[PDB]
Amino acid sequence: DVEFDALLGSYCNTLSLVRFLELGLSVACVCTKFPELAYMNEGRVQFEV
Amino acid sequence: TKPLPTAPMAWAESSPRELAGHAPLRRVLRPPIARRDTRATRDDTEQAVDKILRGARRAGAPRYHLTRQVTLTDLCQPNAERAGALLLALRHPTDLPHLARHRAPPGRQTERLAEAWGQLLEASALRAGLVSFNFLVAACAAAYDARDAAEAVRAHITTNYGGTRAGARLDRFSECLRAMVHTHVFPHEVMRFFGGLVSWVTQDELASVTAVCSGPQEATHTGHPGRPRSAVTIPACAFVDLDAELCLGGPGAAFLYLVFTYRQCRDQELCCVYVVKSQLPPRGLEAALERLFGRLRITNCTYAAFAELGVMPDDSPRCLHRTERFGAVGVPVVILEGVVWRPGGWRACA
Amino acid sequence: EDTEADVPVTYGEMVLNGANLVTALVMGKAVRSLDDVGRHLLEMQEEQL
Amino acid sequence: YLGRGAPPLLDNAAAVYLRNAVVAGNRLGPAQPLPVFGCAQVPRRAGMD
């Protein structure tokens, strides 16, 4: 007498890696990075019309 | 495939005696009378075509007769029980409320069997079908002498058979059989032998049970080529020797026998099925049934009824006494070895 | 769009020949392609991650 | 009355009076009275449309 059990195949995914700048939604960002921010308190921006 | 054990290895081919007939008939002579004085598959399927061709060039093996019968799975189950169990066929059940009305002795309830059968179609709902042997032990479990394995056969059937409250069938189908003893239509007038299990096909509520109605057991096409082998398994409540009880230790072929016992008392009636291994012929069997089952004869005018079942053609027949696991419950199971099925007819003993 | 298509011809196959056999006889189990998984449990115990 | 196993009311000539006052000429109700074991049957329509 001979019998056996098996595994057939194994299946994964792969996480999709999204860079944000790919999106057309990047248009709405002017992105400048501060290496130090948490030190800074309130910043401010000026206009003249 | 041409080994080098050629003393017996040529005899396992069925031989050189095939030319014994072929030489003076086919090899010689001019008589009848003269005058005076594409990488793996194909060859993968290609050897499968050759396997048809290897099977076609030539056409020992004893014969069988396999039978198949499509069977509703209310009372019996070919699923919980493995290959190599007894089975029992039936008749139609609406003859039961008819034959009990005329075959009863005067002074009994002839409307007892007419109501008891409808309470089984109304209990197995919560038609000549089939009853397996192991199912029948747990119903007649409350009449045995070895009651502990009778409470072990009942211990797994309520949990392993397809259906809800199989114990409600067990308590009702035995109530049907306890009504068979009272209404005088005896259960040997109903139960018909069906051969040992080899394979079965499942579906909703019906099963296609294949079995050997005649022949040997151990070499059947069980279906699984990994295990084309099956042995006969019987629970130990029923298996009664008559070699030990009659001190016959002399070797020889043993005969297998199905035996019913009857007990007629007022509303206290019992049922017992026994498989009897004996070296006795059927002509010298009933005298042993007088010896063991005379207590039921005095208290009752039949007392027993039997039929033939098969022959172990061994000079020394071979028994086993093990505890197999059917599901999760260990049942003391008697295993018979080298069993050749040949059925027979029944018998009355008034 | 189009009438005739292009279709593969042969089926696929799996054979126990090789190390995937011996297990089925002794161990009693067979993984689908062990000759790689079994292999890649050796180098991948050294080389890359 | 095709069904079975309901306690009949007590006067038989009263119960056997309803069963006749209903089953008679019913498109459905039984032909031969209940077999004590099996099921009642339904008269066979000569033709269907």
Chains D and A touch (3+ CB pairs under 8 A): no
Q: Which residues pair with B207 in a beta bridge?
A: B71, B202
Residue B307 near residue B273, CB atoms below 8 Å: no
**Residues linked to residue B277 through DSSP beta bridges, in sequence order:** B241, B256
Structure tokens at B170: 């067990």
B225 touches chain A (CB under 8 A): no
Residue A7 at interface with chain C, using a CB cutoff of 8 Å: yes
> By CA distance, what is A3's nearest residue in B?
B226
CA B280/CA B256 separation, integer angstroms: 10
What residues have CB less than 8 Å from B311, skipping those under 6 apart? B253, B254, B255, B256, B340, B342
Residue B166, both tokens: 């199989």
How many angstroms separate the CA of residue A6 from the nearest CA in chain B? 15
What resolution, expressed in A, was reported for this entry? 3.8
How far are the Cα atoms of B2, B64, B133, B138 from residue B255, in angstroms, in the given order?
A: 40, 19, 19, 25
Question: Chain D contacts of B117, Cβ < 8 Å?
Answer: 37
The answer to whether the CB of B273 falls within 8 A of the CB of B238 is: yes
B152 near B99, Cβ under 8 Å?
Answer: no
Contacts of residue C15 in chain B, CB cutoff 8 Å?
40, 44
Are B38 and C10 an interchain contact pair (Cβ–Cβ within 8 Å)?
Answer: yes
Instruction: Give the Cα separation of B339 and B341 in Å (integer).
Output: 6
With b meaning 16 or more CB within 10 Å and e meaning fewer, what string describes B124-141?
Answer: beeeebbbbbbbbbbbbb
Chains that touch D (3 or more CB pairs under 8 A): B
Omega before residue B281 within 30° of 0, cis: no
Cβ contact, residue pair D36, B93, below 8 Å: no
Distance separating alpha carbons of residues B119 and B125, to the nearest angstrom: 10
Taking an 8 Å cut-off on Cβ atoms, the answer to whether A5 and C28 are in contact is: yes
How many angstroms separate the Cα of D40 from the Cα of each of B120, B339, C33, D23, D46?
17, 46, 62, 12, 19
DSSP B25: I
Q: Which of residues 2-21 of A touch B (CB under 8 A)?
A: 2-3
User: What is the end-to-end Cα distance of chain C in Å, rounded?
Assistant: 46
B118·D35 Cβ contact <8 A:
no
Cα distances (Å, whole numbers) of residue B205 to B94, B129, B314: 21, 12, 40
Beta bridge pairs of residue B89? B130, B192
Task: Look up residue B21 and give its two tokens.
Answer: 């007939």
CA distance C43 to chain B (A): 28
Are 3 or more Cβ–Cβ pairs between D and B shorter than 8 Å?
yes
Terminal-residue alpha carbon distance, chain B: 61
Using a CB–CB cutoff of 8 Å, tell me whether B35 touches chain A.
Answer: no
Q: Please tell me the distance from the alpha carbon of residue B33 to that of residue B328, in angstroms, as a whole number.
A: 74
How far is Cα B312 from Cα B344, in angstroms, rounded to an integer?
15
Chain D partners of B119 at a C-beta cutoff of 8 Å? none
Q: How far is C43 from B203, CA to CA, in rounded Å? A: 49
Q: Is B39 on the interface with C (CB under 8 A)?
A: no
Experimental determination technique:
cryo-EM
**A2 neighbourhood in chain B, CB within 8 Å:** 226
Q: Do residues B72 and B129 touch, judged by C-beta distance below 8 A? A: yes
Chains C and A are in contact, defined as 3 or more C-beta pairs closer than 8 angstroms: yes
**Residue B5 C-beta-side C-alpha neighbours within 13 Å:** 6
For chains A and C, CB pairs below 8 A equal 20
Length of chain C equals 49
CB contact under 8 A, C31 and A3: no
CA distance D33 to B74: 27
